[PDB]
Design a protein around this ligand. Structure first.
Ligand code: ADP
Ligand code: ADP
Ligand code: MG
Ligand code: MG
Lengths: 435, 96, 193
């Protein structure tokens, strides 16, 4: 089955290269470029699977896992839902060729099918990565969110199916050692808040830099420098690093971060004498590991491996201008080294759940109004995107509609309705007393 | 190891004995950096002394010299080279 | 139609102009250099009910003249080009009825980004908003209006969400409707009065 999966992953990879018109390097396809790394991390994530849980018949269970993992490094690469459809057809043809005979009852690849090694940690399984059902995922995330609210700063979110899937595939990139996560989406997509949650789900400690109005390159270096002191110590939880487009006030602040995220740590971050004192602390660990000590070559190397494993870099950009594309062109490390993750707009089914959550704890005549309003809230936002597509073709004037725009609209509507209802109630009470 | 890497691996050993530098070209996917990075580990740390340099598109000529200065030890006179006749290798990535 | 299909309790004849604002306040606006066409009333009705800061697009400065009429007292217009615009805005945020920003066509300055955000930080009784190096004391009933003179202006979609966009452009039938209201007042003055 291993050999078949290698020919399969190639077959899918090869059918995409053949369709140069569909997928190619472009201005808006700076990342679309298909490397070894995406095949490598696919091959890496199979190696993550422990023997004891995958022991037995691997005719049904492996192809599912592979297909998922394959899908999550290719879907995120694609921006358009058209490109997605083309890929799924190539993936089915590829599987059906190498496997030969497979049941038509259950599609090998399916949107419902997710794989995560955080669900295992909740159920008391140790280093286990398997397929998790949508309803099980809901219960774990909802429980963990209550734990996050208890200790860290309270974050409200809808926790719809598509947002939860986005939590799963970020948790997955953080579980892989050395590999860095890149989140791309429009302003308000929840990605920064989904990352902070996703980090907390796993056993990792998130550290975001705070940018003041007046900031300097040397001030950034000192914030990073502090983070590397916590990683250097042997018995340390792996530090995640959070960055957004707003946090990057100038392009000079990005240069250090890319050299960190590419490999090891930025050249001449600390002095040579300070580096020597960090190396000595790691030497005590190396004895326990059983790696060659007092070699001063393999040890220094081992220090760079540990630092790489314990530093995770999370980047957040918006693909709205050609400024992000200029970042890709300028900064080579970012697009190739990190694992891209693209946020699509919220589905019609998800928007209904958002409205249904905000309408809760508001009085209504029969609460059937609530369930209907929640539909109309989704229908109105969708009908704007269809009108916005019509507006883009008809006139040169560009309008943009984001999920934060939608959230803020709902809060304003709710406040206006509550104020009008309160005024009407006061007037009716006065009229009743007078009567 | 691959058929393609082993034959390039031989070409590097040939090109390391000589003072002739090597330049690798190909797409992002091809896996050049790793093939060089494997070799630098397999080389003896006394004979050859390896260092990686990565340009992020803001690396000025002055900043490159600071990286070279640190790599090269101070020989007798104006000349700067490694002590005990060690050969100094500087690896460059994202050259263009 | 989609409100009737669901069957949600609503009045038989709804129009957005009536909800946003009463009839009397439309008659006030008419006096303050506004036309009687519904498109301009809708636009004027939006900025009143806006939960976000309103970015206005005004070729022929039709919107700007209305804003100046409405804000009769303590209105200050500060262009991006002015060198003390950071210092003026900070002193305005503390004790300013209203603020107007000229130009700001596209690429909005990073110093305004925290102000543009409707979320404000409350320190005890007082409210504090962080603009520039030093935080400045925020007072309630502060208004911020952003006017931009352009045709097909291009904004960041993150900004189009953050700040509600509204256009005062007199085009097609939109200008016709204004001339009718003007003509009617000259022709049948008695009926309008
Ligand atoms: N699913 C959601 N449910 C509720 N509120 C949300 C949701 N997603 C985002 N938000 C709100 O909108 C904000 C979006 O900002 P952020 O999470 O940083 O995303 P982005 O980087 O796309 O702007 C959140 O901080 C939160 O206040
Ligand atoms: N034998 C190999 N095993 C694993 N990865 C390899 C191997 N050979 C090359 N690679 C890949 O090579 C890449 C690093 O070198 P290279 O592709 O030249 O880098 P770049 O694309 O930045 O020029 C990584 O994707 C790495 O996985
Ligand atoms: Mg945000
Ligand atoms: Mg490389």
């Amino acid at each position: 089955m291993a050999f078949k999966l290698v020919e399969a992953t190639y077959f899918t990879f090869d059918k995409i290269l053949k369709n140069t018109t569909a997928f190619a390097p472009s201005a808006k396809r700076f990342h679309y470029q298909f490397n070894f790394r995406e095949l490598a991390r696919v091959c890496e994530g199979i190696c993550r699977t422990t023997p004891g849980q995958y022991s037995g018949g691997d005719q049904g269970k492996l192809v599912r896992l592979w297909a998922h993992e394959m899908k999550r490094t290719f879907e995120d690469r694609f921006i358009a839902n058209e490109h997605v459809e083309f890929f799924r057809r190539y993936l089915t043809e590829a599987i059906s060729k190498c496997i030969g005979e497979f049941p038509e009852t259950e599609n090998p690849i399916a949107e419902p099918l997710i794989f995560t090694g955080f669900v295992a940690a909740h159920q008391g399984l140790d280093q286990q990565y398997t397929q998790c059902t949508i309803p099980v995922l809901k219960r774990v995330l909802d429980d963990k969110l209550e734990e996050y609210n208890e200790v860290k700063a309270q974050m409200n979110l809808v926790l719809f199916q598509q947002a939860m899937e986005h939590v799963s595939r970020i948790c997955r990139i953080l579980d892989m050692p050395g590999n860095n996560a890149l989140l791309v989406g429009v302003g308000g997509s929840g990605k920064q808040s989904l990352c902070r949650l996703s980090t907390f789900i796993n056993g990792f400690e998130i550290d975001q830099l705070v940018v003041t109005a007046s900031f300097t390159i040397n001030d950034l270096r000192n914030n990073l420098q502090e983070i590397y002191k916590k990683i250097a110590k042997p018995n340390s939880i792996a530090r995640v690093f959070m960055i957004t487009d707003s946090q990057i006030k100038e392009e000079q602040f990005l240069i250090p971060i890319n050299d960190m995220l590419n490999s090891g740590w930025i050249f001449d971050l600390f002095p040579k004498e300070d580096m020597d004192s960090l190396v000595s602390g790691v030497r005590n660990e190396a004895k326990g590991e059983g790696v060659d000590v007092n070699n001063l070559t393999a040890l220094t190397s081992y220090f760079l491996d540990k630092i790489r494993k314990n530093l995770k870099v999370v980047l957040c950009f918006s693909p709205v201008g050609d400024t992000m594309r200029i970042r890709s062109r300028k900064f080579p490390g970012i697009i190739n080294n990190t694992s891209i993750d693209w946020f699509h707009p919220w589905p019609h089914e998800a928007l209904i759940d958002v409205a249904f959550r905000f309408l809760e704890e508001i009085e209504f005549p029969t609460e059937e109004i609530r369930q209907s309003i929640s539909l109309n809230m989704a229908k109105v936002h969708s009908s704007i995107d269809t009108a916005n597509e019509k507006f883009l073709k008809l006139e040169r004037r560009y309008n943009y509609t984001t999920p934060k725009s939608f959230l803020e609209l709902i809060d304003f509507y709710k406040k206006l309705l509550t104020e009008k209802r309160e005024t009407i109630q006061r007037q009716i009470q006065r009229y009743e007393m007078g009567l | 190891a691959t058929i393609h890497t082993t034959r390039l691996r031989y070409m590097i050993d040939i090109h390391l004995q000589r003072r002739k530098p090597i330049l690798f070209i190909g797409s992002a996917g091809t896996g050049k950096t790793a093939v060089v990075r494997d070799y630098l580990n397999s080389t003896r740390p006394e004979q050859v002394s390896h260092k990686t340099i990565n340009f992020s598109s803001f690396t000025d000529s002055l900043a490159l010299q600071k990286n070279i200065e640190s790599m090269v030890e101070k020989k007798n006179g104006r000349n700067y080279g490694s002590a005990t006749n060690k050969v100094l290798i500087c690896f460059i990535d994202d050259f263009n | 139609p989609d409100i009737i299909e669901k069957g949600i309790p609503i009045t038989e004849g709804i129009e957005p102009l009536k909800i946003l604002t009463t009839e009397a306040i439309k008659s006030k606006w008419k006096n303050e250099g506004l036309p009687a066409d519904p498109m301009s009333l809708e636009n004027a009705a939006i900025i009143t009910a806006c939960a976000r800061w309103p970015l206005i697009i005004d070729p022929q400065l039709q919107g700007s003249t209305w804003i100046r009429g409405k804000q009769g007292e303590n209105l200050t217009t500060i262009s991006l080009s002015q060198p003390k615009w950071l210092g003026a805005l900070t002193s305005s945020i503390s004790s300013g009825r209203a603020v107007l920003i000229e130009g700001i066509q596209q690429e909005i300055d990073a110093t305004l980004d925290p102000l543009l955000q409707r979320a404000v930080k409350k320190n005890g009784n007082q409210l504090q908003l962080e603009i520039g190096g030093d935080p400045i004391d925020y007072d309630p009933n502060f208004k911020l209006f952003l006017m931009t003179k352009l045709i097909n202006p291009h904004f960041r979609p993150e900004i189009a969400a953050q700040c509600t966009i509204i256009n005062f452009i007199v085009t097609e039938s939109g200008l016709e409707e204004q001339f009718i209201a003007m003509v009617v007042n000259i022709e049948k003055n008695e009926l309008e009065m």
